[PDB]
Scaffold this motif. Structure first.
Motif, short mmCIF file in Angstrom:
data_model
loop_
_atom_site.label_atom_id
_atom_site.label_comp_id
_atom_site.label_asym_id
_atom_site.label_seq_id
_atom_site.Cartn_x
_atom_site.Cartn_y
_atom_site.Cartn_z
N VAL E 19 -28.62 34.15 47.35
CA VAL E 19 -27.44 33.74 46.59
C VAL E 19 -26.84 32.53 47.31
N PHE E 22 -21.29 31.88 45.75
CA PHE E 22 -20.51 33.03 45.36
C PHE E 22 -19.29 32.59 44.57
N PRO E 23 -18.77 33.44 43.68
CA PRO E 23 -17.60 33.04 42.88
C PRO E 23 -16.41 32.69 43.77
N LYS E 24 -15.59 31.77 43.28
CA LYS E 24 -14.40 31.36 44.00
C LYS E 24 -13.46 32.54 44.22
N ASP E 25 -12.93 32.64 45.44
CA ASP E 25 -12.02 33.72 45.78
C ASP E 25 -10.62 33.38 45.30
N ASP E 26 -9.99 34.33 44.62
CA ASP E 26 -8.62 34.19 44.13
C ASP E 26 -7.82 35.41 44.54
N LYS E 29 -6.38 38.11 41.96
CA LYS E 29 -7.24 39.23 41.62
C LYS E 29 -7.34 40.16 42.82
N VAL E 31 -9.47 43.51 44.77
CA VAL E 31 -10.76 43.47 45.45
C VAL E 31 -11.87 43.99 44.54
N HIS E 32 -13.04 43.35 44.64
CA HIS E 32 -14.24 43.78 43.93
C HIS E 32 -15.45 43.19 44.64
N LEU E 33 -16.63 43.72 44.32
CA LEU E 33 -17.87 43.13 44.79
C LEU E 33 -18.36 42.07 43.82
N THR E 34 -19.23 41.19 44.31
CA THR E 34 -19.64 40.02 43.56
C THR E 34 -21.14 39.91 43.32
N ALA E 35 -21.93 40.89 43.75
CA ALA E 35 -23.38 40.77 43.62
C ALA E 35 -23.99 42.16 43.75
#
Lengths: 196, 168, 183, 106, 120, 30, 130, 125
Positions: E19, E22-26, E29, E31-35
């Motif tokens: 990968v 990774f998606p931009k951190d904001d 929002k 907490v969550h996983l991204t992959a």
RNA sequence: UCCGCAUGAUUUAUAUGUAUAAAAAUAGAGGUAGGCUACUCUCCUGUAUCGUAGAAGAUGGGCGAUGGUUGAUGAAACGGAAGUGUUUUAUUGACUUGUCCAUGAAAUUCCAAUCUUGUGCGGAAUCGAAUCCAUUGCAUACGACUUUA
RNA sequence: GCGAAACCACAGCCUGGGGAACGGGCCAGGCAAAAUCAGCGGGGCUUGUGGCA
RNA sequence: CUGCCGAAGUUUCCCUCAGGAUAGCAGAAACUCAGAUCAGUUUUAUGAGUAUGUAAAAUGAGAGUUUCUAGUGGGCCAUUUUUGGUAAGCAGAACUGGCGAUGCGGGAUGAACCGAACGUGAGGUUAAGGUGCCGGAAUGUACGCUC
């Protein structure tokens, strides 16, 4: 005039080639030089003029296997290093050894922000360029041709200045105290005839 | 540096002209020989008297009578231009006539890219009446309450420790 | 020329602090902070007057002295009188629908020339947009800074330009009518 | 321990040369603290010294020394000319030399 | 011809797809996983009602080929923190768990059998 | 460079510029 | 090197110079004048001490009897006890007796001679007025 | 500002053989040269440029183009000297000059006193 | 691997005092007390500031200050941009010019500490991987790669 | 496992310039990290505008 | 192997041809006058319509020969003239030097540009060209122009 082991130059307000020429002479003179805060270096000429000067540099690349071609470094430290390298006989062993005595970094890292930073009056913009003359900063000129760390370096510089100011306030508080005790001693004016 | 010379010259005496008239002109040369050479060139071009037929009777360097009184000089010159014919008149303010001529020569080499060769100084005149001063820059200098910030202060020991004050 | 001068008389505009080319002009109406670092000129504050001074300046440099005078005068007017811009809508067939949000700092434009694109503009800071009732379908832009009010008036006008049609016949849009002050 | 250094620090810059010719007969020394020729008249005639370290140990002493003499000022910026008994190797451009205060005349 | 965006055409230096972004951190929002990480089991086909307005088969049956990949639940076994630096992200520290199963310990050896199983 | 051409005139141009200047002067003399 | 010493007498080529041995411990020695920096420190009187007994032969070495002599036995000999005559100390003490009153008279002088001269960073000898 | 090229301003010469001397501007020849004079005998009235001077903070009234005698009389009357020296700027310069003239023995005199000065290090707990 | 003496020494773009951290403008900045501040003062580069006095830094004494100062410490706090450290420390043992005294240097009789291996010391504790051979086929001209062992 | 020959001053990165022929050596740059395996054979002109009176 | 001397390209004509001649140059041997005996030079006078020649003052040099005998008899570059000339170059002669036999400093580099004509070295000083760095040498001083 007198050499140290290492010299740390704060490169804010210095001209690119004017500073690189002095640094080129000091390196072959045999002295380690560290140039800090490269992303505030100045170049004569208005910004768009120099942006074209560097976008022509992007045009030079070998037509066969461009990985062989010229490598157009974007970081302000690397642009300053290009100036110095072209001002050195890098195609030899003594020119090669002069580069190895040169450090160019953007901002002031912790290994160097606790040491004195000298300036080069032969390259200072305020003493060279006539008032009203257009000029461009290397840090801005890099953040528009690929260099992608301008904001983080500015972010870290702000924190470093805060820490450095707090140190200076503490050092001034101590320094004003000893100065009060310095003048308090009577022997001061029984040595005043010697000018101290 | 330049120096001002008065040179008096005449042609050789002969049966045709037993007592030739003295011809004196003030001209600016860096040395004695240049003054004589410029004198012969001037007299040949103007009056048509040959170098061989003449001889110098007097050459005297002239110092400034008042080298400490601020004076204003007006200089009429005949510039040799691309066409070889052009006239000029420039104003200067300084303490010595040689200074005005020297400043004029540098002014010519700058604003017209001229030589010592192409310049022919007609007359240098001391101007004393204020209202007789023509040029704008010098006139504004003559006002009584002159005052201005130090223009172009600009100020081995490489690697100075503190940022220059470069101000007051 | 050694000295070019320009003189400015300061009205009851309270604070005219000029530290580091930066003027914080505050009047009864409000406060405007402006920067003049771009020019290199002398600015002296002698009581009831402000002296704009250029020493040994070229004509390229000298031309800035009037501009600096003019902009300082404009911001003085803003904190004393303010700026008002009346724009009159022109609709031939389709009415131009306008919606006001955030006390009138954002304008929504609908039904322009029959288009269903929502032409939305955010007014430059210090600019308030209101719909006046005395005259139908015309807009009043109020603010302290002439530059921001005028540019906002320009932004709205250039948003609703007729396209591919004739200026001769399709002369529809938003146009600035009057350029005055609050009092 | 700062009760020493009866010498003056200097650096070796190059040989006396033109752009396409070098003469290793004389070496150009930058005496640190000297910024003109009228000042370089002081060090004119002093005993300059190049100190280096080797692999083999003669005298049980690890330090070899190449002696030399300041000969003439070289230029405006306060550089001098030096004549070392053995011409300095070209690897010693920028190497530090010592300038003894003798033969003294002050 | 051939696209120039996919050269040097050389064997991938990896087997598991890296990968590279990774998606931009904001921070707005939470907490969550991204992959995630699965195994391509194979593909089949399906029949689906198509609710796309304006499409020629709105509210009509289509047939679609679908890829089935099996993803047994991943096990979190560490946390790493990267620090922003002018020279780019730099892995500052790494912290692990206590019970690292034999499945992941095998990743640290070319020969799991002959090793002394001395990892961690 | 920065330009659309090269400022260093190749030695052919350094060669034939002066002679063509010489032919120009001869033309005025004629 | 670096010591400060008072010049007693002016020899043919050298200077017969000593630091007061009770002060710093520099015995009476010949020194060539090219390795001497004549400081402008206040002068110490010398008329009170005789200086004719110091001659070149007075300071000269003994013979050598061959071109080579060495070994630590040659080092355990001479030394500042054996080949050092008692008459030299008599001369050395006589000098100290005749100079200490002068050095004691003016302040810092005994302390000045006890100290050692050394350069510092930013100290340029061509500008230092010794 | 604080430094204006005024007829009657005293300037400190920073170039030439009169470096360190104090003179007063008597006249303005042009943009780059001014005529200066000083009551000090060694310093003659002459035309000096502006790269060779630095402007001081003292302005004393003096009519245009005054002669040497009048300038000296006005300088004495208005107490220009001992007004320039009252500043800490002049005191710093005089300290530098006298510290330049110290010999080796005086340097050891400086050595001893400032070590006595240093060891006070008395601060409130 | 160190304790540990060494033991021979190997040593230095070492090094000769590896001396010094605001920030910004240069048609301006900074500092003082009192209630956003009126006013006073500072700048004009470091030739400055800090340390610097001794058998390469000896052995004693007196006077005076609770200090300076170091080696070694037993601990707290802080420093992530490359944390190359900063600080708080209490401690020990020194050293102890702030000031004044006594011993000793010499015939070296005109110039020529830190750095680590080293090799072993006799006392401590320490108990890994990779490849070939084989296997796999997601890979493959051969290497290589993905597995198993 | 057996096992040639042609060829060979010396060698082998690229841009511009070196009067010419500009080159592989020169100059100014770009640069430049061993050993190899298999494919592919690559090697200052000039313009938009006619001639006579 | 070292040392020494050292041209020529165009002449003197001649030719069927290539060539020679012939000089020139370089020389090799013999013999006058210590000379107005000469000159890739100037000057004065003199006639004729600054130049012209003759004659003579300056200036430097020892100045002549008769005799025989090697090598060369090209071309290029630039200057000055120069008639035909045209979009424009182009052509024509005569002359001059330089180059062939010539290395060295400088102009980034170069057959001709700028200086300089070479035994082995030391030191000193310069020419041309340069003194930000590459690069030895002032990020010199002063006055202007230019964005």
């Amino acid at each position: 005039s007198e050499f140290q082991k290492v010299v740390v130059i704060d490169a804010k307000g210095h001209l690119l080639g004017r500073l690189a020429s002095v640094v080129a002479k000091q390196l072959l003179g045999g002295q380690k030089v560290v140039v800090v805060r490269c992303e505030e270096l100045n170049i004569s000429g208005h910004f768009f003029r120099n942006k074209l000067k560097y976008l022509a540099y992007l045009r030079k690349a070998c037509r066969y296997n461009p990985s062989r071609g010229a490598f157009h470094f974007r970081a302000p430290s690397r642009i300053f290093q290009k100036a110095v390298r072209g001002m050195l006989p890098h195609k030899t062993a003594r020119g090669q050894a002069a580069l190895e005595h040169l450090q160019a970094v953007e901002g002031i890292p912790p290994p160097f922000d606790k040491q004195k930073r000298v300036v080069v009056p032969a390259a200072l913009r305020v003493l060279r360029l006539k008032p009203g003359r257009k000029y461009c900063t290397v840090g801005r000129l890099s953040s528009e041709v690929g260099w992608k760390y301008n904001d983080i370096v500015a972010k870290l510089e702000e924190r470093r200045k805060v820490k450095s100011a707090a140190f200076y306030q503490a050092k001034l508080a101590k320094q004003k105290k000893i100065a009060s005790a310095k003048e308090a001693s009577p022997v001061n004016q029984k040595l005043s005839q010697f000018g101290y | 540096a330049l120096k001002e010379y008065q040179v008096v010259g005449r042609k050789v005496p002969t049966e045709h002209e037993p007592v030739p008239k003295l011809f004196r002109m003030r001209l600016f040369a860096p040395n004695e020989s240049v003054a004589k050479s410029r004198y012969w060139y001037f007299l040949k071009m103007i009056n048509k008297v040959k170098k061989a037929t003449g001889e110098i009777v007097a050459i005297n360097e002239i110092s400034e009578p008042k080298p400490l009184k601020a004076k204003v000089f007006g200089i009429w010159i005949r510039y040799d231009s691309r066409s070889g014919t052009h006239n000029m008149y420039k104003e200067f303010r300084d303490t010595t006539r040689v200074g005005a001529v020297e400043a004029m020569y540098a002014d010519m080499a700058a604003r017209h890219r001229a030589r010592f060769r192409s310049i022919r100084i007609l007359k240098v005149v001391e101007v004393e009446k204020k209202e007789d001063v023509r040029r704008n820059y010098v006139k504004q200098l003559l006002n009584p309450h002159l005052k201005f910030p130090l223009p172009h202060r600009r100020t081995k020991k490489v690697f100075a420790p503190h940022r220059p004050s470069t101000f007051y | 020329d050694i000295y070019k001068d320009e003189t400015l008389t300061i009205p009851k505009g309270v604070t005219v602090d000029i530290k580091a080319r930066n003027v914080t002009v505050t009047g009864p109406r409000g406060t405007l902070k402006q920067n003049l670092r771009h020019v290199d000129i002398e600015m002296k504050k002698q009581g009831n007057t402000i002296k704009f001074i250029v020493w040994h300046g070229s004509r390229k440099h000298n031309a800035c002295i009037r501009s600096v005078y003019s902009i300082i005068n404009n911001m003085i007017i803003g904190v004393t009188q303010g700026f008002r811009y009346k724009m009159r809508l022109v609709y031939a067939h389709f009415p131009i629908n306008i919606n006001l949000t955030e006390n009138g700092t954002v304008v929504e434009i609908r039904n322009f020339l029959g288009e269903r694109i929502t032409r939305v503009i955010k007014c430059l800071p210090g600019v308030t947009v209101s719909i006046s009732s005395a005259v139908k379908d015309e807009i009043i832009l109020e603010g302290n800074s002439l530059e921001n009010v005028s540019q906002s008036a320009a932004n709205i006008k250039q948003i609703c330009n007729v396209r591919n049609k004739d200026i001769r016949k399709f002369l529809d849009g938003i146009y600035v009518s009057e350029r005055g002050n609050i009092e | 321990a700062q009760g020493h250094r009866l010498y003056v620090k200097a650096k070796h810059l190059s040989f006396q040369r033109s752009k396409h010719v070098i003469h290793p007969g004389t070496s150009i020394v930058k005496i640190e603290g000297c910024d003109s020729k009228e000042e370089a008249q002081f060090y004119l005639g002093k005993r300059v010294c190049y100190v280096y370290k080797s692999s083999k140990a003669v005298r049980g002493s690890k330090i070899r020394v190449i002696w030399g003499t300041i000969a003439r000022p070289h230029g405006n910026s306060g550089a001098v000319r030096a004549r070392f008994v053995h011409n300095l190797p070209a690897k010693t451009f920028g190497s530090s030399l010592r300038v003894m205060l003798y033969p003294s005349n002050i | 011809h051939g696209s120039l965006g996919f050269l040097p055409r050389k064997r991938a230096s990896r087997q598991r797809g890296k990968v590279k972004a990774f998606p931009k951190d904001d921070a707005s929002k939470p907490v969550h996983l991204t992959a995630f990480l699965g195994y391509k089991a194979g593909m089949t086909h399906i029949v689906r009602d198509l609710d796309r307005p304006g499409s020629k088969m709105h509210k009509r049956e289509i047939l679609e080929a679908v890829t089935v990949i099996e993803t047994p639940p991943m096990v979190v076994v560490g946390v790493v923190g990267y620090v922003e630096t002018p020279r780019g992200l730099r892995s500052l520290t790494t912290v692990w768990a206590e019970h690292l199963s034999e499945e992941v310990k095998r990743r640290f050896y070319k020969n799991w059998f002959k090793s002394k199983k001395k990892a961690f | 460079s920065l330009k659309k051409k090269s400022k260093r005139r190749t030695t052919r141009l350094r060669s034939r510029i002066e002679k063509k200047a010489a032919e120009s002067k001869r033309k005025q003399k004629r | 090197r670096g010591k400060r010493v008072v010049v007693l007498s002016q020899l043919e080529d050298t200077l017969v110079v000593t630091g007061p041995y009770k002060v710093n411990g520099v015995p009476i020695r010949r020194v060539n004048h090219r390795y001497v920096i004549a400081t402008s420190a206040p002068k110490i009187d010398v008329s009170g001490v005789s200086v004719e007994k110091f001659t070149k032969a007075y300071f000269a070495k003994q013979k050598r009897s061959g071109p080579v002599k060495k070994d630590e036995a040659f080092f355990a000999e001479n030394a500042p006890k054996n080949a050092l005559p008692a008459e030299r100390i008599a001369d050395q003490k006589a000098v100290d007796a005749k100079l200490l009153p002068a050095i004691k008279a003016i302040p810092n002088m005994k302390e000045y001679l006890a100290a050692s001269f050394a350069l510092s960073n930013g100290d340029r000898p061509h500008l230092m007025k010794f | 500002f604080k430094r204006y090229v005024e007829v009657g301003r005293v300037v400190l010469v920073t170039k030439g053989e009169y470096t360190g001397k104090l003179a007063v501007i008597v006249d303005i020849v042009d943009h780059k040269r001014a005529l200066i004079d000083s009551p000090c005998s060694e310093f003659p009235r002459q035309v000096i440029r502006y790269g060779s001077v630095v402007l001081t903070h003292i302005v004393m009234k003096l009519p245009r183009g005054a002669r040497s005698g009048i300038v000296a009389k006005k300088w004495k009357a208005q107490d220009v000297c001992n007004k320039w020296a009252s500043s800490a700027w002049a005191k710093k310069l005089e300290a530098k000059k006298v510290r330049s003239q110290l010999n080796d023995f005086d340097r050891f005199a400086v050595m001893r006193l400032k070590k006595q000065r240093r060891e006070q290090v008395n601060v409130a707990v």
